[PDB]
Amino acid sequence: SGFRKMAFPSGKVEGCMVQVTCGTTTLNGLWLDDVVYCPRHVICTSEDMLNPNYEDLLIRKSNHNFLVQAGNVQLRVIGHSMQNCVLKLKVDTANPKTPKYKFVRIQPGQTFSVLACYNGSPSGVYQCAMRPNFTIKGSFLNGSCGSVGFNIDYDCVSFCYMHHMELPTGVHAGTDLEGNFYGPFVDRQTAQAAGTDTTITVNVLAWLYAAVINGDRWFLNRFTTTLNDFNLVAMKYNYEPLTQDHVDILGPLSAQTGIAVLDMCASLKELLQNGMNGRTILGSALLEDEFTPFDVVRQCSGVTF
Amino acid sequence: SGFRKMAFPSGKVEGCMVQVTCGTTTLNGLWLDDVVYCPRHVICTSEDMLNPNYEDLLIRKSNHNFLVQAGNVQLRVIGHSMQNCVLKLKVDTANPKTPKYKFVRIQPGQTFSVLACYNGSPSGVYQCAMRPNFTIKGSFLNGSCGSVGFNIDYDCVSFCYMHHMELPTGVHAGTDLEGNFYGPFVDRQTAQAAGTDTTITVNVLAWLYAAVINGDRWFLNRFTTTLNDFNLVAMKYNYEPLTQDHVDILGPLSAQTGIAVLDMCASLKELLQNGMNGRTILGSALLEDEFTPFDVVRQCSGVTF
């Protein structure tokens, strides 16, 4: 037993990480088949990032200007193109370590693992959630751009995020692997409002179920509630409204524990209105929203890859 | 910027994980060079674990009774021996994916990454600390035994933990890779007292420095303290006593931030005596002790492998 904020094993992604250098800028690329993907801002100088004309900047570059190194092996670049905010560098060798993979655009409130990298070399791995406002709260230093987020199902890596920028607020923004930003963000060094964020209610409920499964149950009570009543409380506390689709996704956890979803909502209602009373749940003194229902089922059932 | 509880990239360890079956029991093994390491309790039935005679049980087994599979390839077992609480199965093929590695016995209060595995297949990765009382608070289900803990420095994997058992309290115990348990624990299904635990003070202080580096600084104050005075408070709150060796290890973080260690101790003293006042630090509502000073330096400087 026990419940930890676990990331997927990162080896299948580690084998895809490369370094990309254009001019004086170095960041990370992702090498899959005979294409390397990376943020298009690799082509900017520090002066360009205030309002770059990416089309004009890219025109001044040729294939031989993109230096791509996988470990200590240099790749030969035979074409380049910009797709939204990503560059795609065609190379003459397919990556022998390419895993089965796909590109997915994830929904807010879903989770994924990030492999943080610098100069093409992996540094560490951690799990996180796409916030309702399409930012992530990661750990990204200068040179981490191009690090990717992913999920793994069976033998297939679903790539969902590439890191592009740190907002002045210290939160992080990036794109899917087609180069479309999540959220309203653009790849230029300007102040950019992130929307109002909310707490991911269905994830909090999943984590409360995870707690009960593991023996933390002091928060269970004699009360119940209704979807309407609970959503009045969710609104007061800046939680996402709960829908029947959310209740349905929680069905397997409700069945396993025997705790009806609306009964668990009444536990959550009381925790929101009264706090935790100096107590903890699964080692946390606040309500955790970075585990999805699937994450809970997966971890408590021991799925592997 | 940003600060996350990051694990090392796990790919170098993933390539070493195998399944070991003896009789009806299946768990995980670690394949390095031409040796597979796994918990010796693979040779027990469910009835044996109350007080197994491991010497007698092992005598009834021969090389061909240990079924070892790396992915879908079967390994040929050419010898077996017990070292403390681990079995070492010599196989006729050296693992082509063996990383540069060493075996280390870590000290309480140090951290490491765990690759949780089932049936030889990796499931997830997470970071954790060896508690002062030589237990770990992990995520381990039935079949996870033989999963390993490790650190990586440059290109060298230092293996430090193999998982053996869940105590009736729900905390976890295991061995170094020579099969010596951390703590007083034995590999038999009996109630076993874990010692009194404490909070790892030097790690809390490191994390407070990490917070200041990242912009969380509301807890800094106008006070200072002495090692003696702070240790009176540490004793009241069940924190490890702080020593000059600990102060010395915190030197680089003190230099970077300009905050003298004893000044940060005065911040910690106030947090212990007064709580967090409904506030958070690096996304946490309690004082975090699972980051060492080295972990903080590493993450804030972007070291890679």
Curated annotation (Swiss-Prot), chains A, B:
Catalytic reaction(s) noted: TSAVLQ-|-SGFRK-NH2 and SGVTFQ-|-GKFKK the two peptides corresponding to the two self-cleavage sites of the SARS 3C-like proteinase are the two most reactive peptide substrates. The enzyme exhibits a strong preference for substrates containing Gln at P1 position and Leu at P2 position
Question: Topological domain, Cytoplasmic: which ranges?
Answer: 1-305
Q: Where is this cross-link: Glycyl lysine isopeptide (Lys-Gly) (interchain with G-Cter in ubiquitin)?
A: 5, 90
Q: Where, subcellularly, is it found?
A: Host cytoplasm; Host Golgi apparatus; Host nucleus
- Signal peptide: which range, if any? none
Tell me which residues this entry annotates as catalytic: 41, 145
Q: How is its activity regulated?
A: Inhibited by pyridone-containing alpha-ketoamides compounds 13a and 13b. In turn, alpha-ketoamide 13b (tert-butyl (1-((S)-1-(((S)-4-(benzylamino)-3,4-dioxo-1-((S)-2-oxopyrrolidin-3-yl)butan-2-yl)amino)-3-cyclopropyl-1-oxopropan-2-yl)-2-oxo-1,2-dihydropyridin-3-yl)carbamate) inhibits SARS-CoV-2 replication in human lung cells. Inhibited ex vivo by michael acceptor inhibitor N3. Inhibited ex vivo by compound 11a and 11b.
- Which branch of life, at top level? Viruses
Q: Which residues form the Peptidase C30 domain?
A: 1-305
According to the record's subunit comment, the protein's assembly and interactions are: 3CL-PRO exists as monomer and homodimer. Only the homodimer shows catalytic activity. Interacts with host FBXO22; this interaction promotes the proteasomal degradation of nsp5.
What is the documented function of this protein? Cleaves the C-terminus of replicase polyprotein at 11 sites. Recognizes substrates containing the core sequence [ILMVF]-Q-|-[SGACN]. Cleaves and inactivates human TRMT1, preventing tRNA guanine(26)-dimethylation of tRNAs. May cleave human NLRP1 in lung epithelial cells, thereby activating the NLRP1 inflammasome pathway. May cleave human GSDMD, triggering alternative GSDME-mediated epithelial cell death upon activation of the NLRP1 inflammasome, which may enhance the release interleukins 1B, 6, 16 and 18. Also able to bind an ADP-ribose-1''-phosphate (ADRP).
What name has this protein been given in UniProt? Answer: 3C-like proteinase nsp5
Q: Which residues of the full protein are shown?
A: 3264 to 3568 of 7096
